[PDB]
Design a binder for this molecule. Structure first.
Ligand SMILES: *[C@@H]1O[C@H](CO[C@@H]2O[C@@H](C)[C@@H](O)[C@@H](O)[C@@H]2O)[C@@H](O[C@@H]2O[C@H](CO)[C@@H](O[C@@H]3O[C@H](CO)[C@@H](O)[C@H](O)[C@@H]3O)[C@H](O)[C@H]2NC(C)=O)[C@H](O)[C@H]1NC(C)=O
Ligand SMILES: *[C@@H]1O[C@H](CO[C@@H]2O[C@@H](C)[C@@H](O)[C@@H](O)[C@@H]2O)[C@@H](O[C@@H]2O[C@H](CO)[C@@H](O)[C@H](O)[C@H]2NC(C)=O)[C@H](O)[C@H]1NC(C)=O
Ligand SMILES: C[C@H](N[C@H](C(=O)O)[C@@H]1CCCN1C(=O)[C@@H](N)CC(=O)O)C(=O)N1CCC[C@H]1C(=O)O
Ligand SMILES: *[C@@H]1O[C@H](CO)[C@@H](O[C@@H]2O[C@H](CO)[C@@H](O)[C@H](O)[C@H]2NC(C)=O)[C@H](O)[C@H]1NC(C)=O
Ligand SMILES: [Cl-]
Ligand SMILES: [Mg+2]
Ligand SMILES: [Zn+2]
Length: 605
C-alpha cells in the first residue's frame, strides 16, 4: 500500500474517532473509484487483460481495508457502540469489518481470481446448435416461443452451459468467504448478510409474511397451469403436479408476464401489453430513459447529470465485444460519475427495468454528500423498491394513455380484472422465487447443504415453493443455481423479496400524500410534488438512520406488512379463487414426483 493511503495517529476516544473518520474519507474516495472504474472497464469489454487489471485494483482495496480496519479495531472495538454521534457509530462499525481483507495474500489472490472467472463463465456462455447468447437470443425464445421442444432446447442448453463448469469454482469461493468473515465475528457469510437488517427476528418475520402471501400464489399457479394444459395437452401438463420450469415466459420461471397473451381473462378488451405500439411508434433505448427521467423530474427529484448521459452504455455494443449484459446501476464514489449498463431492448417489461435501475441512480444522487460508508439504502430492500414504486404508476392504463401508448380507455369490471391479472403475473409469481434463493444460499454457507447436495436441495426448494419441475432429468453434476446471475456474481437476493412487499407500502403512502382517493391499483403519482418531497426525505438519509424509524416516518408503521399488497390485488384474488373452484382445480401439486416426458426424437428437430 502507498504510504499516503495509510492511517496516521489518533486518540482512543470519540474526539479521535471523528478525526479518524475524516481522514479515512479523504483517501477512501480514491481507492473506491479506482476499483469501480476497473470493474466498469471489464464489464463493458471482457478480456483477460481487463480481468487482470480489475484483480489488481481489488488487491489494493483489500490492503487499504486491512490497514484502516486493523487500526479501527485496535483503537475503538470496545467503545464505538457507545459513541454519541450515530453517523460515527455506523462509519467505525463498517470499517472494523474487514471481509476478504482478513485473508492472507495467497488466499486473497485466489478469492479475486474466482470472482473474475465465475463472472466470465456466466456472461460469455452460449448455446450452440446441432450460437445463441442469453441476451437477446435465449431471453426472446423463452418469452415468445410456444414450441415445447424449442423452449426445452434453450432451457436445457443454458442450464448445462453455465451451471456445470461453475460448480468447482463455487465450492472454493464458499469456503474462502466463510474463512474471511469468521474473523469479523460471524459464524458464516449468510449471518453477515442477514446482519444488515439489524433485526433478531428476521427469518421468522419473513416466514410469517410468506404464510399470508402463499394462498394468492397457489391460486395464480392453478389458473395458469389450466391455460398451459389447453395449449400443450395432457402429455406435457399434469393438472395435479408441478409445472415444467421452461413454460412460464422466463429462463428462471421467476415472473410470468410474458405469457399474458395465453391467460388473459377477457381477450376482447384493449391489449394492455403495449410492446407492439412501442415498436410501431419507433421507440429506442434513449427514448425509454428520457421518459423515465421525466417522471422523476415531475416529482421534483433530480434529473440525470451530463456525466450519466456521456458515460452510460444503454445498448448492446455492435462491434461484437463481449460484455456483461445483465442490467446494473453504478456509483463511482466520487460524487460526479453515475452510470447504467444495460443491453436495452424495446419492450414493455424492459421499460420497467429502466425505471428500476434509474431508481438506484436517483438514490446515489440524493445521498452523495454523506460520508462514503453511509452511501447505502436504509436497508438493501429500500434500494430495490424505489424504481419499482414509480413503475407501478407508469403501468396504469390511465398513465399509459397520457404518454400515448394506449388509445382505447375503459373503466369496467373486466378491464380491472385484466390489469390486476397482468400485474399478478409480474409480482405475485415472483414471491416464492425471491424468498427461496437465499434459503438455498444460507444453507450452503452454514454447511447444511454441502457440495454433494447443491442440486438436490435447490430442486427441493424450487418444487416446495414455486411448484415447478425440471423438464429433463438432473443430477449432482448439474449446478442449476449457478445458472442464475446473482449466484456466480455474488449478489444477495432476499432484498428482492423485501422489496416486493415494501413497494406496495410505499405506493399506498405516496398515493395518500398525493391526495388520491380512488382504488389503490388505479393511483398515478405523476406530477405530485408532495409525494416527491416525502420520497426525497428517505433518499437523502442514506443509512444514517435505523430503517424501522425511516419506515415509521414514511408510512406510519415500523415493520414490513403485507396488508397494502393484499389490498392492491383484492379484486383479482377473489376472482381467481372463484374461477378455480368452478373448474374443480386442485390447489397445489400433490403428485410431487411427476416430470414430463421427452419430445419424440429429441433433440433432432
Ligand atoms: C373507475 O370506477 C371506480 C368505481 O366504479 C366501478 O365500480 C365497480 C362496480 C366496477 O365497475 C369497477 O370497474 C369500478 O371500480 C371509481 O372508484 C371510485 O372513485 C371515487 C373517486 O375517486 C371514490 O370516491 C371516494 O371514496 C373515498 C373512500 O374513502 C372517499 O374518502 C372520497 O371522499 C370519495 O367519496 C370511490 O370510493 C371509488 N369507488 C370504488 C368502488 O372504488 C374510479 O375512480 C374509476 N376510475 C377511473 C379512472 O375513472
Ligand atoms: C448426470 O447426467 C449426465 C447427462 O444427463 C443425463 O442425460 C440422460 C442420460 C438422462 O437420461 C439422464 O440419465 C442424465 O441426467 C450424464 O452424463 C453422461 O455420462 C455418460 C457416462 O458418464 C456418457 O455416456 C454420456 O455421454 C453423458 N452425457 C452427456 C450429455 O455428457 C452423467 O453420467 C449423469 N451422472 C453423473 C454422475 O454425472
Ligand atoms: C435487473 C436487476 N439487476 C440488479 C439490480 O438492479 O438490482 C443488478 C445486478 C445485481 C445488483 N445490481 C445493481 O444494479 C446494483 N449495483 C444496484 C445497487 O445495489 O445499488 C435484477 O437483477 N433484478 C431486478 C428485480 C429482480 C431481479 C432479477 O432480475 O433477478
Ligand atoms: C477492450 O479492452 C482492450 C484491453 O484488453 C483494449 O485494447 C487496447 O487498446 C489500446 C488502444 O487502442 C491499445 O493501445 C492496446 O494495445 C490494446 N491492448 C490489447 C491487449 O489489445 C481495447 O481498446 C478495448 N476495446 C474498446 C472498444 O474499448
Ligand atoms: Cl440483502
Ligand atoms: Mg419478463
Ligand atoms: Zn435493483
Amino acid at each position: 500500500l502507498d504510504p499516503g493511503l495509510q492511517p496516521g495517529q489518533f486518540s482512543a476516544d470519540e474526539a479521535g474517532a471523528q478525526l479518524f473518520a475524516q481522514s479515512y474519507q479523504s483517501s477512501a474516495e480514491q481507492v473506491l473509484f479506482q476499483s469501480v472504474a476497473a470493474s466498469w472497464a471489464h464489464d463493458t469489454n471482457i478480456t483477460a487483460e481487463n480481468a487482470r487489471r480489475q484483480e489488481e485494483a481489488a488487491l489494493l482495496s483489500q490492503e487499504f481495508a486491512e490497514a484502516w480496519g486493523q487500526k479501527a479495531k485496535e483503537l475503538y472495538e470496545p467503545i464505538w457502540q457507545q459513541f454519541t454521534d450515530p453517523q460515527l457509530r455506523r462509519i467505525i462499525g463498517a470499517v472494523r469489518t474487514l471481509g476478504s481483507a482478513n485473508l492472507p495474500l495467497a488466499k486473497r489472490q485466489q478469492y479475486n481470481a474466482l470472482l473474475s472467472q465465475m463472472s466470465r463463465i456466466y456472461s460469455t456462455a452460449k448455446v450452440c446448435l446441432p450460437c445463441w447468447s442469453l441476451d437477446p437470443d435465449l431471453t426472446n425464445i423463452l418469452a415468445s416461443s410456444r414450441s415445447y421442444a424449442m423452449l426445452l432446447f434453450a432451457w436445457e442448453g443454458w442450464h448445462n452451459a453455465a451451471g456445470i463448469p461453475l460448480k468447482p469454482l463455487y465450492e472454493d469461493f464458499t469456503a474462502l468467504s466463510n474463512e474471511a468473515y469468521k474473523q469479523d465475528g460471524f459464524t458464516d457469510t449468510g449471518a453477515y448478510w442477514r446482519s444488515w437488517y439489524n433485526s433478531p427476528t428476521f427469518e421468522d418475520d419473513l416466514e410469517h409474511l410468506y404464510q399470508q402471501l402463499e394462498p394468492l400464489y397457489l391460486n395464480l399457479h392453478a389458473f395458469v397451469r389450466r391455460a398451459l394444459h389447453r395449449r400443450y395437452g395432457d402429455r406435457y401438463i399434469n393438472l395435479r403436479g408441478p409445472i415444467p420450469a421452461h413454460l412460464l415466459g422466463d429462463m428462471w420461471a421467476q415472473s410470468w408476464e410474458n405469457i399474458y397473451d395465453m391467460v388473459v381473462p377477457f381477450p376482447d378488451k384493449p391489449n394492455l401489453d403495449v410492446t407492439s405500439t412501442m415498436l410501431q411508434q419507433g421507440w429506442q433505448a434513449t427514448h425509454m430513459f428520457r421518459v423515465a427521467e421525466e417522471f422523476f423530474t415531475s416529482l421534483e427529484l433530480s434529473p440525470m447529470p451530463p456525466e450519466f448521459w456521456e458515460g452510460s452504455m444503454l445498448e448492446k455494443p455492435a462491434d461484437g465485444r463481449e460484455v456483461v449484459c445483465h442490467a446494473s446501476a453504478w456509483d463511482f464514489y466520487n460524487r460526479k460519475d453515475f452510470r447504467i449498463k444495460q443491453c436495452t431492448r424495446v419492450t414493455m417489461d424492459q421499460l420497467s427495468t429502466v425505471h428500476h435501475e434509474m431508481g438506484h441512480i436517483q438514490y446515489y444522487l440524493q445521498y452523495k454528500d454523506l460520508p462514503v460508508s453511509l452511501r447505502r439504502g436504509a436497508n438493501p430492500g429500500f434500494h430495490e423498491a424505489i424504481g419499482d414504486v414509480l413503475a407501478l404508476s407508469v403501468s396504469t392504463p390511465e398513465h399509459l394513455h397520457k404518454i400515448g401508448l394506449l388509445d382505447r380507455v375503459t373503466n369496467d369490471t373486466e378491464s380491472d380484472i385484466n390489469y390486476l391479472l397482468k400485474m399478478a403475473l409480474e409480482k405475485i409469481a415472483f414471491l416464492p422465487f425471491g424468498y427461496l434463493v437465499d434459503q438455498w444460499r444460507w444453507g450452503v454457507f452454514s454447511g447444511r447443504t454441502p457440495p454433494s447436495r447443491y442440486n438436490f436441495d435447490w430442486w427441493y426448494l424450487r418444487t416446495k415453493y414455486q411448484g415447478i419441475c425440471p423438464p429433463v432429468t438432473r443430477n449432482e453434476t448439474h449446478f442449476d443455481a449457478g445458472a442464475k446471475f446473482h449466484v456466480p456474481n455474488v449478489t444477495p437476493y432476499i432484498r428482492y423479496f423485501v422489496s416486493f412487499v415494501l413497494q406496495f407500502q410505499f405506493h399506498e403512502a405516496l398515493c395518500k400524500e398525493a391526495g388520491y382517493e380512488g382504488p389503490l391499483h388505479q393511483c398515478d403519482i405523476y406530477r405530485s410534488t408532495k409525494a416527491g418531497a416525502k420520497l426525497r426525505k428517505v433518499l437523502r438519509a442514506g443509512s444514517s438512520r435505523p430503517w424501522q424509524e425511516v419506515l415509521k416516518d414514511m408510512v406510519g408503521l415500523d415493520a414490513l406488512d403485507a396488508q397494502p399488497l393484499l389490498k392492491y390485488f383484492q379484486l383479482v384474488t377473489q376472482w381467481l379463487q372463484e374461477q378455480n373452484q368452478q373448474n374443480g382445480e386442485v390447489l397445489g401439486w400433490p403428485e410431487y414426483q411427476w416430470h414430463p416426458p421427452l419430445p419424440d426424437n429429441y433433440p433432432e428437430g
